[PDB]
Each structure stands twice: as C-alpha cells, then as structure tokens.
C-alpha cells in the first residue's frame, strides 16, 4: 500500500455508528492527503482530513 | 451511492522525478463499480506498448496527463514512471 492513494473523497459524513477504524495514506507523494475509514460492512472509504467531521471522527475512533 | 462506492483507495504509479504519484489511466475498479477519477486528477497516459513492458523500474518516458471525463489528457510533461509490485 506504499503507492495506494485516495483519488476521490466521500462528500457526505459517514454516520459515526457505522465506523470501525481509520488509517492514513502513507505516501507523501499521494496527490491528495487522505484518511481511510473502515466501516461495519468491511468497506474502505476515503475521507478528506481537512474537514472537521473527519477530524472529529478520527479523535473518536482513537479513544 | 456512486460517490461513496468510488471513494476507494487505489494503487498509483510511482516515478523517480519526485512528483506526485499518478493513476494509470483514469478508471479504477472497486466495490463492484468501474470508477472514473475526478476531472483534473493526475494520471499517466501510457501507450499499449508501454503498458506491455511496464515494470518495477522506469524503462520509458511516461506521458503525464489530467483526467477529464475518463480520458487522461496529456499535458506534455514526461516522467520516469514505474509500478510498485
């Protein structure tokens, strides 16, 4: 996953009860810095870390 | 739904030029959908012959482009691109 990057972000907020965890894309050379949420349906969804709801859910899942 | 389904992490091609990773073409398959990268997104447009010999080190100058309704529109910049494996 060293060259795995998010080309598109989800535009609407994912309901908090539907999330499991997250990770960041690890290449600094990815065009768009991204966080990857993993949902209860075992899906990986790209989200824009410049949005507040993404920041808040990151803190939530961290605890 | 189309947006969420297509907001999947995707493998990009690397390069030795120190610039951003770029998609090979402008389409990616995930979650049961052949997705199109958003207009403006960076891509490589490789010829059929270049794709045939694409490997884990650069062996051809790869045309840089931008995605536009599913086509990688070349902008004239050339890079030494390669696949990660």
């Amino acid at each position: 996953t060293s060259t795995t990057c998010c080309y598109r972000f989800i535009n609407k907020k994912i309901p908090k009860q539907r999330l499991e965890s997250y990770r960041r894309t690890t290449s600094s050379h990815c065009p768009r810095e991204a966080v990857i949420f993993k949902t209860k349906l075992d899906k990986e969804i790209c989200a824009d870390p410049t949005q507040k709801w993404v920041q808040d859910f990151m803190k939530h899942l961290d605890k | 739904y189309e947006e969420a389904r297509c907001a999947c992490p995707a493998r990009h091609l690397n390069n030795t030029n120190g610039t951003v990773l770029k998609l090979l073409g402008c389409h990616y398959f995930c979650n049961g959908t052949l997705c199109t990268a958003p207009d403006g997104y960076p891509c490589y447009n490789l010829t059929a012959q270049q794709v045939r010999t694409l490997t884990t080190y650069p062996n051809t100058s790869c045309a840089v482009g931008v995605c536009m309704k599913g086509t990688c529109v070349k902008n004239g910049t050339m890079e030494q691109c390669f696949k990660t494996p």
Side-chain angles (χ1 to χ4, degrees), chain B residues 26-43:
Chain B
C26 292
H27 295 96
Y28 201 77
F29 177 80
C30 49
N31 301 319
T33 304
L34 200 48
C35 299
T36 311
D39 290 347
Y41 195 84
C43 53

Side-chain angles (χ1 to χ4, degrees), chain B residues 2-85:
Chain B
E2 181 69 25
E3 298 308 292
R5 256 154 192 88
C6 282
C8 64
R11 319 177 56 91
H12 285 46
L13 292 187
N14 208 336
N15 62 74
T16 57
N17 304 80
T19 63
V20 296
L21 309 175
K22 311 186 168 61
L23 276 180
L24 179 48
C26 292
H27 295 96
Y28 201 77
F29 177 80
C30 49
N31 301 319
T33 304
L34 200 48
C35 299
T36 311
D39 290 347
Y41 195 84
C43 53
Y44 289 115
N45 190 328
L46 304 188
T47 68
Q49 206 39 51
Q50 290 180 307
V51 177
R52 277 193 280 271
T53 55
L54 177 65
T55 183
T56 56
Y57 61 92
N59 57 5
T60 197
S61 296
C62 312
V64 173
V66 298
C67 290
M68 192 55 57
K69 302 191 163 83
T71 291
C72 187
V73 177
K74 315 171 162 180
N75 68 6
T77 293
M78 308 300 279
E79 290 188 333
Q80 323 298 306
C81 81
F82 62 96
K83 66 185 288 185
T84 186

